Amino acid sequence: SEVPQVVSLDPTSIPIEYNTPIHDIKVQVYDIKGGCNVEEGLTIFLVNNPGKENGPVKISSKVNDKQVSEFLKDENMEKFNVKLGTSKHFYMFNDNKNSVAVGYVGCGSVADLSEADMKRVVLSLVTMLHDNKLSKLTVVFEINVDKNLFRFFLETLFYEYMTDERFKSEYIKHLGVYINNADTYKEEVEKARVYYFGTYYASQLIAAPSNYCNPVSLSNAAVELAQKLNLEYKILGVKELEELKMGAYLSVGKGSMYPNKFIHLTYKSKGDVKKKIALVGKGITFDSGGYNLKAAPGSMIDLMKFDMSGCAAVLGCAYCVGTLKPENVEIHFLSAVCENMVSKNSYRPGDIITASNGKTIEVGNTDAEGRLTLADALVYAEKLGVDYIVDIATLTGAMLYSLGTSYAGVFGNNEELINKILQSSKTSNEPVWWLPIINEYRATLNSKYADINQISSSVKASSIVASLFLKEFVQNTAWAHIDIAGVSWNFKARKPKGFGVRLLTEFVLN
Amino acid sequence: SEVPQVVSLDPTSIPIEYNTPIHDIKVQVYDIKGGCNVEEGLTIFLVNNPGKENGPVKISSKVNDKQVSEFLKDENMEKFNVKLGTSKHFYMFNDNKNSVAVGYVGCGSVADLSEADMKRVVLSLVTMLHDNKLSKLTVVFEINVDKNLFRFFLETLFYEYMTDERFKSTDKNVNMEYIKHLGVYINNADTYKEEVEKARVYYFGTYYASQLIAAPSNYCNPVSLSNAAVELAQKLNLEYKILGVKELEELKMGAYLSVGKGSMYPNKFIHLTYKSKGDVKKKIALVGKGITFDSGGYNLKAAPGSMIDLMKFDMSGCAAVLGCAYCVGTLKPENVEIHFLSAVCENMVSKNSYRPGDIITASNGKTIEVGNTDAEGRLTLADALVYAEKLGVDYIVDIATLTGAMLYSLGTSYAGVFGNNEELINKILQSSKTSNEPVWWLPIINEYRATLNSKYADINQISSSVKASSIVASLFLKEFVQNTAWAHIDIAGVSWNFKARKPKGFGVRLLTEFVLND
Amino acid sequence: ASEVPQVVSLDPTSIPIEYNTPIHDIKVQVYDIKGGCNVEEGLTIFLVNNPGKENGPVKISSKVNDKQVSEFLKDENMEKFNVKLGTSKHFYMFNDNKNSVAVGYVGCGSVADLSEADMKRVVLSLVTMLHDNKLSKLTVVFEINVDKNLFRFFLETLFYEYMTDERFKSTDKNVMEYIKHLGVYINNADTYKEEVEKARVYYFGTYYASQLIAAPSNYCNPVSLSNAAVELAQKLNLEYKILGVKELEELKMGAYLSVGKGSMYPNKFIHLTYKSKGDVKKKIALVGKGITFDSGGYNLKAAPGSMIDLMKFDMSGCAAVLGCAYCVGTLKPENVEIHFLSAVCENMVSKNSYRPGDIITASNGKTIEVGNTDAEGRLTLADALVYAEKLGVDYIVDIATLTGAMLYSLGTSYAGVFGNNEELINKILQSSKTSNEPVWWLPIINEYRATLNSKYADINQISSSVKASSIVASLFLKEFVQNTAWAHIDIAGVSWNFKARKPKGFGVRLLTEFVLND
């Protein structure tokens, strides 16, 4: 509970905004039939041109204002083109002599937008919102979008529009949406708002630097979230962890001034529990690499506050599930939180350590610390007697070379569970790709001295070798592992994505 | 046709062994229910012990010899276990009072062996064949295998047993003599017998690919490699055409010709065709990356771990396609037309080389800005793919040692497949299953396409920002196929067996099963 | 004499060489200290030490035939100065004839036998007194004990360090006059007199090697360096043959030819012979590594510390062998026949170069798999060693700037010697002692042999596992000498004087003492 400080100026909690200006936005969804009213703020049409690449903008919707209708005539609009993400917007007076702004965002020439296309269409909309004092935005869909992609549009808009000023020392109040078949989309709105905040909450924990967000203050934040949502919570400290013989996890934290803290939140439905799930997130608050210091070119030590992204995804999922309250499930949200540091007290390369299932592990590289903490977390998860264990983790830099920055990799011991994850990837619009656990590489983890090696010396397929290592810690339960090392941080925008909150929540709900 | 030389000691063709000692092995398959005769050479039982530890060895088969039968009693065998890859030798006198050698290889406790496990079994078998002058080997299957896995056992035995001595002169070979006979005992032998000569053809297509890949870049160059393809086409009665520089210039193959500019060997584009006698129901083009040495060009392979010493293998894709032409031309499938294509060249450093930054024009008119001369495979493939699509085929499959990133994604065991068509990808995955050459479907992520936008050219050769290079390479190749089902198999990680220091000949069987299944 | 090819008309077509140096004009007079020293024009330096007493006082013990100078040099005046090694002082006074004279001393420390390294320090101090002082004469008075070999070494070193190489100066010549006379006073002078002309010959052989080594690779290429060797043989009346590529192809020297494939200069193999007029009792071949520029080839020297800019020095072995030819041809030993060999070429990057992975055939028929084009010296030496053994000699000794690892093992002062014959290694070590060019015996460790086993060729050029690269090189070379006493001297660490930014001409005196004392 008490956060240790070196100097009195060291922060002792993570600042969190719960009430955000996005929560004050009043959303109305209208059917496009009957025509669109343009009375105030900014109205943006989402427009494509199928086949005709970079073709002219042509607005289909009737607008119940004569001045705006004249602006939206074909001869004016064709001066502009639909190239994905291209936008124009103009101020003008409407029928009432009132100043309105009217424009469009180009949606290209493919009928069905991918999540990546929709993010580009959203960023372009947010740019306008950031550069225009407005009380109201109205968005007219002249493109096809299913219910899930619509919700995704809203979540992305809310998340990209929100700006995080916690460490710095007027938003719209109304959103209107015109869309064909509007009634079918209305239930997405408040679900979007919930998903936005789980994602934004995860984002807040990830962006919070390692002097603010350390094992103590992160577990404290998790307890405060549990209290607000009425989840059961338990934080395990060093003495309990020693009792449980979590030697792999405790070894990683030996070099930190912050004591290890193991987070365990539980959601339990009111009636009968029919499925029990453990979600396990990697929770390294700062990964220096330890004695295997991140000193090689491209090792990105300055980004390593984000190594608790998996833990943050798990907590953002706890917010969504605690809010939406799925029935018939029991969900354990887990993270073995610690920091990986260089000290006289640190574990060393070569050390042999003993995990809570009795397996001795030879440490080949202190920078492969995530798999050690997850080993002990997985043994703990399995002892709960759950139906599914899913872990999420910024585990291997190799992901940038295999899937890159857009799609996370999923590995597991159970194809039905993998297919569930992939379905949740589909409906959350957070992309994941199934990657194999190749048993041929297992022999490269046979240690000469210990029961098992932490790392391969020979195999460069390190995401696969990591999965093989984790698999040794799950004996007889369906388990999947999501490596989010490549996807978690939005390098271009200099901010987290909060990747995985919606994926995991869609998994639990559906 | 004529191989240019710098000095008269420079080789002018690739040595190729067609009749190998493996071809001399007389193979006989007998049904195990008739019992086993143990009169001679070495007799090996393949034994497992299903779901049971490192359980004991117990022989199931009837053995038509009292002496041998007495030796193989459970009591005598109990001291030995079935651990995967272990083996034992026994020695005894048979009813004929003739000494015979008998033993076993352990096949584990899992009732179904993986491709990787079967290879471990075979390697153990080959150890017992090495350093033992034997006229005959007999293998008794006390484990069960489907026809595909039986064929794979034979193909693997043949390939692993064959020793390539083309480049030994003073350092042969002294004690190396092959068995002349192989006997196999298996249940329902009659259904397995067909697999024998199929395995023999598959072994040779893959060993032929291996011979081309292993041949160093002074032997195997664009001229001698295309000369070999011609000789292969002549032997198989395939139609063949090698396009030289003048014809490649006429076809405007600027991306391919740029790559070979700095080489002393003229570019040679290989085009062989197999056509079935009846109705042609399916037309397929198989395209192989054919870089006979990859120095990297002006982006020289000088970085730690860039493996320049290995770059003779950068024509492994072409070798697979030629190995497949051997299998297809030998098995003669019906209903198909198959084009076997490789844009062969060498990637060298010279006053004549293409440079980083050059803008070159592919044969479909797309201008390409070269961002790195070591991304050469995709440039040759771009013009080979334009060529392939002009043939009007149903499927185009390319195979290439294209990106070193494959080592970090799937590693050394599984190849990655990418494509623009789900049906075609699924046909490739099914061929992977039946050839037992492992492949894994990887995505073409369209979000990365924007990073190939060039300020000046129609497209960049490489990404500014994306490190997922195998995916970027796929997005690039996709720009060279307009309206045809296409898949791309990246064999950079799987082609060379780093432990055994020799090619695998990866792809030959996969591509042949693909053609045959269709 | 071949024509040197040029790219532009400004490319040089020969190496400039100075034969008649200012050192050759110096008249040397040796006098016995018992007669007293006469002190007149020029500069008279006493070499003084003080055994026991570190930095002890200077005391001049020789009789000086001049009352004024004797008064000046009395103990009372001299004791304010000390003998610290390399320390020096100048004195000015009027002698008994009222003529001003300059006198001084160099400290030789407090250890009674100076090492080769200590003597070099004394000589460097002496040279600084010669520089920037227009002197007609230097006189040196030995008040330290030196044996005949150390006396000679003093003179060789003095001559070598004093000589300034201005061949490539144009606008920046040192506006530098040399003494015309050198007087030496020493006890038992008659016994040292024979060392004077021997020192003068050894100086020139060393300085000649140095001129070849310092000549840049545009001046000293394989054609111009073999032409210089022809010219030297003509001057000394040695037999000579230069083998060109047609004859090298005929001899099947595939290893040597492969290295040179990338060069615009044809390979030239140098073969000089000295034979004594009497009955020949010993036949010796001296082989020098002759790479006129080592870029690394496709394994380009781009790694930090690869020192590509120093690689004109990669013919230092060849230079030492030609410097030896100079000494031998001049001093004319009896009862011996000596072959001076070098397989000269340039290691370059080109469409024509050999490649990592190429398999090439040496002249003894061994096939060699190229693992790294930057291990080119051992490939040229392989063929030169086969040629050398065919001559029917008693000893083969090669000398080469072969491995960078020498800098990590013995460093910049001692060369390493490896061999297959202890009697011959001991002879080299004895020559090292009497030449004062230090060498240390290093082992050829047979355990590493197995790491040169090639999967395809008869042998690997390089190890993939063993980092002891100098020993691995020696193992590889050993395979090319079948039945003859052989030794190998690796001078990679010792050839270039990094501090002084010039060659040492290392090996000339060592190899000459080897020849003479046999």
Ligand SMILES: CC(C)C[C@H](NC(=O)[C@@H](O)[C@H](N)Cc1ccccc1)C(=O)O
């Ligand atoms: C030594 C390796 C097998 C494991 C090692 N893993 C790690 O360092 C993880 O702890 C890193 N937190 C994963 C990572 C590294 C760089 C960028 C993004 C994400 C890695 O280098 O990938």
Ligand SMILES: CC(C)C[C@H](NC(=O)[C@@H](O)[C@H](N)Cc1ccccc1)C(=O)O
């Ligand atoms: C420049 C890069 C974007 C692409 C580059 N591609 C290449 O170098 C290919 O031409 C190489 N032939 C691929 C390769 C490299 C190392 C081991 C096996 C295979 C690579 O990454 O490997």
Ligand SMILES: CC(C)C[C@H](NC(=O)[C@@H](O)[C@H](N)Cc1ccccc1)C(=O)O
């Ligand atoms: C590839 C390696 C086993 C051998 C390699 N050898 C060479 O490069 C020789 O050809 C070089 N001439 C060795 C050298 C390097 C630096 C300073 C002095 C001498 C070396 O690095 O020493």
Ligand SMILES: [Mg+2]
């Ligand atoms: Mg780490």
Ligand SMILES: [Mg+2]
């Ligand atoms: Mg390349």
Ligand SMILES: [Mg+2]
């Ligand atoms: Mg070299």
Ligand SMILES: [Zn+2]
């Ligand atoms: Zn980490």
Ligand SMILES: [Zn+2]
């Ligand atoms: Zn390549």
Ligand SMILES: [Zn+2]
């Ligand atoms: Zn060299």
